[PDB]
Structures are given as structure tokens and as C-alpha cells.
Amino acid sequence: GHSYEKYNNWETIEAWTKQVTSENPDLISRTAIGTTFLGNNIYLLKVGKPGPNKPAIFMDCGFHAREWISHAFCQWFVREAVLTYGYESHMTEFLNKLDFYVLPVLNIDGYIYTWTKNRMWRKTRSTNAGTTCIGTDPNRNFDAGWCTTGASTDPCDETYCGSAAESEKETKALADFIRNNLSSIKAYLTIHSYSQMILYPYSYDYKLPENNAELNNLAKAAVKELATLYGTKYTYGPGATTIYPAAGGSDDWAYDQGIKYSFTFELRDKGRYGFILPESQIQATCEETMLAIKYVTNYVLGHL
């Protein structure tokens, strides 16, 4: 069965998306925003007390198949929303005043593959012309300085940028959804691991966003709140100079669409376990991450 304290396979997560929606029809509705290369449904949970014309915060997890703590957190966040709504004042205010669009697993095909064949798989599982090599890095596949830096034109590389921007069904689906809801989505948050960082644009170039000062102070504040729980230390800054240049990322793309608050979260740890974070650390990781997420949410709320 499903546990928030364990890593769940796709079959279990998919059944979970239906069950948690069904158990909390007052707080959650579910759709799909598209299907994957292998025909899996890219579920999207809309979390909030329904109301006319509400602003939204968008969060995805599971861009990269092997970063399991990512998938775990989206699941954790939704449980926390439904558990604490009406019992903890900030989350109650949050769900009352806005919606969270939570996309629990973007790269479903790849995720299944880490469970069935290769735990260190990163990319999608789409085929490529002219080679047997599989998959595109979905976070090199967005239309933002696409394939200009930090990416590879070689399909056999794990940072392969795809045959074109949005060449992947999953990234096209995500891009399509955000454009179709641009006027309500006020923040874009994409969850990765690992490195313990909060990054913002830009990654495709060394240039800085016009609200650079604003984004740096917010990530800084967020990193502080995150630490308050266990002292976990996060770094922060523009993607390009903070971790490395990487064109085609969803955070940069979303920002260039006009979404002023765009962050990539790299969760635990800093390399000791890396992608294979032990399940015993799921709870603490998600708890401290909740604080940074809730702080950004509060901030967005008072800056509409």
C-alpha cells in the first residue's frame, strides 16, 4: 500500500492520486494535463478550497526519474495540506485564498524505469532518430535559451536537450498547461534533488532577472526558515553561477512567461547518499521543505 514515509512506485502513486482526491473532495480535484511517451497520465492535483478566480501556485516533482525524494515530497505536501487545513492557521489561509497545482510526477515513464531496470535513470524514455539511445532531459527541453549551454546534442547523454524545445510530450504538456493558466499562476516551483539549494533564473545565461534582488532575498529568507527545524543548510542564487549553466530549464522558461516567482528546489542531501536518500530521511526532509514552501507561499500571497 501507499506510505508517505516510503518511496512508492507509479502504480501506487497513481492509485493514491485517485484515493486522496476521493477522500478529500472538498480540498482536492484531479485532472491530467497530458500523457507520456508511453501513454501514462500526467496527473495534476488542484489543492485548495474552491472559489471564483483564485490565484495559484504551481509545483511539480519528479522531473528527473532517479530523484525519488522529489516525488515523495509532492505526496507529503498534499497530505499536509489536507491534514492541517482547519487546524493550522497559515495552511488554512493558504488553501482558502489560493490553489496549489501539484503535479506529483512529471516524468512517469522514467520513474517506472528506475523501479524496473535502472535506478540511476534520469531522462524520459522516448526514442530518438538515428540512435538506440533513449530519452531526453526534460529540464533541457524547455524553450529558454534552448540547447545553447549546459546541455548536449547527443541523445546518449543524460543532459540531452531533445530534438527541439517541447519535443517531449511531458514538457509540452507542462508548458501548455502553464500558458493556458498563465493569468492565475503566480509562482512556479519545481522540486529536484540533490544539493540543498534554492535556485532562481537564470540558468541558460549569466544575465540576471530584473527582480533579481527580490528573488535573492526571498530564497534567502526561505533557506533560513528551512534551517529552523534541523539546521539543514541550503545555498541559493541564480542557477548559472550557483550550480552550473543549464539551458532549457522549466524554471527559466516559466519566469520568461511572466511568472515572477520561479524557483528550483534541490533537496537532500549533499552527496553522502545522493539520489538514494534512505527512506528514514523522507519525513525530516519533507518537514523542513514544507517550511520553505510555506514561506514562499505566504510571500506570494502578500504580493499579488
Binding site: 532517479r66 530523484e67 543524460e158 543532459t159 529536484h192 534533488s193 552550473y244 543549464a246 539520489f275
Partner: peptide, 5 residues
């Protein structure tokens, strides 16, 4: 999450 950064 690129190996090994």
C-alpha cells in the same frame, strides 16, 4: 542532479 555535480 547531473553526475557528478
Amino acid at each position: 542532479x547531473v553526475y557528478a555535480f
